[PDB]
């Protein structure tokens, strides 16, 4: 399942889709091209339910005339009226019974062989209908900014500390410095391109920040969450863009499996299949793994990183989402204030959105030797969209319940991306002897105050 | 290369040699073995080398008789007493210069033929040589107790704490009624068996105990090391077993990479190619890394856990590594002791040692509830066996030092500080109450003073 098909059958929900599709930048007709493709599609089921109905009158009538005794009739040959009737879904139950058993039985497998026929076609409409799906946005919130390009397009909402100042040595050069660092090729020869180890007072740090930005989350009533690492092909598709499998993950030979790129994916998966028939209080999950990114200079962009993630389910009623939105941007801008790096926060503009978010704040923090904002956390509101994909259904779920389904929402953002976070520190807390470590963190690392150029 | 050839041409290292594979339960012919395929790969060499002193014979003559416009000759062919004396190593420079410019340009040509044909030869005998130096194991250390079964060989060297205490709930019990714990379907069939999701106060402790096993080390000389959890084939291949690509390593596809089984892989590999001229102090390297084994109830078994490690590098000389690997079974100990589980710790018989270890130890820990010595711990020391795969040089070189006769490689060792998932199985088991888990008191800094985590 990619999305589900009721607001494309609704004329006022089809059309807000299209003007989301518009507001994107995106093609509105992708919602046509999905409303003829199920068009197609529901028309297999209204055959597929009308022949699976004529087969079990074609079992009782053969019961019947097998109790009575009738004889099995003269030929077993179907009459091109019956078979012209069952093609156009209008055989009625009343003529099946005017037929012998031979007939009887000759059009039971007929009918049979047409309903393995219509599931061959009905699986290749969902296909298509799937694949369209994947090219649809999440309806954009009312207030995103509405341009193509992120350069001129996005709006800076809130701004902290001081973001002219200047240093001398960017984080490559610090690292190197402390001799904490390897990227040369006693690395790259052995792992590939972009990888590296860290040593002494590096890692150190890195566990710092590990440790305090889940403290920081469990204190905000967020439920640490440790997931695997991997996602069989199927449930990873069910959290992941097309486009991320050939530039993002790497594959897993063990059955075939991927790495994840994030704790959000093993996250939202985890909930598929879900039922919550009320969210009084949303679920919050502090995750904490290790990212793999195919990604096809220092710590800065690497195939290998620990992340820190905000995750929540919420109730879809009452806007709520966008209430636990505001409350994890603000958590990501606390969390910088307390390692004192200045950063800007950014509304991003509806043509650079992922299809998954309605709408998404980054907190770009500044680095003052590399003079430049550097994207250092992304805070989404998903809506219902990734809800649709996993089956994460919200609501009343009792018995008799016939045939608008109710989706929880979802929301997702980085608290601490561990490396760029590193990169961060190490250019606003150098010194000419190494670097310092800021205040909340010196507890998670054996009161050390600073660590020492080599 | 998998081991230097040196000690299997010495008549007295080969004995050695063939003592130790009979100590292990393994064959000592294979020494033979690798005898012989070196003795007909030195003969290959010994042509090589008498062919390549010839080819530049003639690219001599051939310039020497050209200077003196000498015409080019009436032949081409190769008096055949010329073939048989290079077939057989004993062509002399005079012979060669005997021949008109013609003959040289076609015996050079027939020379570089000869030289292709003995490296294809030479390329058949170390593939060989490589094979059969796979099943030698390394010399074992003479306290190594002699036996092949583990479950009765192996000797009980210390024990701690109370080792037949019992408890009432298991760690799979525990952590289920706990509620931070899922191995159920809605894990299995997102990641496949033996997945798992921890949630909660068994997080904050799996963090807990990676930042104190960090710490225990630090305080103890090492220098943390955060590894790349990916090696290419070529790479691994020089710190795995070929047993181990296909039981335990996940291959990735990104250039085919090994996701890592432990950070003792990444951490030896890093010292490939290295040369160290003394090691006055050790290296000492705190891995922490993820650990990923194909494995081909709980979280005691799984595919996937975090692992502290414990790695040295240092000098080969004066048996220092065996200090070192009493140090480290000593830290992994106190380590226990301070969180207080108690244990006991084995010498590894012959026959279940690694191919890579001289000896090991393993700390076992009592599991009450299970009612079981489980492993927690394997501390080796791996002398010069790994260092020799990965090429990791000590000392002088031979060349221009005549009392260097011998290639000297590092020692290396490794042991677990800390296996974290199996860690928490057994601190549940001993720490449980009827209301939930207690918190060992060195681990409540590390999780905000927590003092106990609670059954659901
Ligand atoms: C080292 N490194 C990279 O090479 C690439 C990205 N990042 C940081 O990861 C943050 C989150 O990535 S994301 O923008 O794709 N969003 C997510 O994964 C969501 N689940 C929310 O976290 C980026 O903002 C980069 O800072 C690296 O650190
Ligand atoms: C969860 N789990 C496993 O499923 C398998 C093993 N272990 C622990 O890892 C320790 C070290 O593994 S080892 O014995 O193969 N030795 C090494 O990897 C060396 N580099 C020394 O660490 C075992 O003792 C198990 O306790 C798991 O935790
Ligand atoms: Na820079
Ligand atoms: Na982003
Ligand atoms: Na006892
Ligand atoms: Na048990
Ligand atoms: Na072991
Ligand atoms: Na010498």
Known sequence: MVLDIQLFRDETGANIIRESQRRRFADPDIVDAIIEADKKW????????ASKKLINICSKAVGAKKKAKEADGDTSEIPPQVKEAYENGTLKGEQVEQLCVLQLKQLS????????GLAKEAQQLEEERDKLMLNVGNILHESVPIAQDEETGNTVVRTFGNTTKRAKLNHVSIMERLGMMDTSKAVTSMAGGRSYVLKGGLVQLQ???????????VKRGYTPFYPPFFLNRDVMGEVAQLSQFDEELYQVSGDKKYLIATSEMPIAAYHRGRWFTELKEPLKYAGMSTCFRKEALGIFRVHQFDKIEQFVVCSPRQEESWRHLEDMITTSEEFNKSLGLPYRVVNICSGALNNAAAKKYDLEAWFPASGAFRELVSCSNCTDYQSQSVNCRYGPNLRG???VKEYCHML????????????????????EEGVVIPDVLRPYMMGIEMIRFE
């Open 42 to 49: 529901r028309r297999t089921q209204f055959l597929t339910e």
């Open 109 to 116: 497998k007929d009918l049979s062989d047409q309903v393995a």
């Open 207 to 217: 566990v710092a920040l590990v440790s305090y930005s889940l403290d920081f989350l």
């Open 401 to 403: 319940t016939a045939a």
């Open 412 to 431: 997702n953002g980085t608290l601490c991306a561990i490396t760029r976070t590193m990169c961060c520190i190490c250019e606003n807390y150098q010194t």
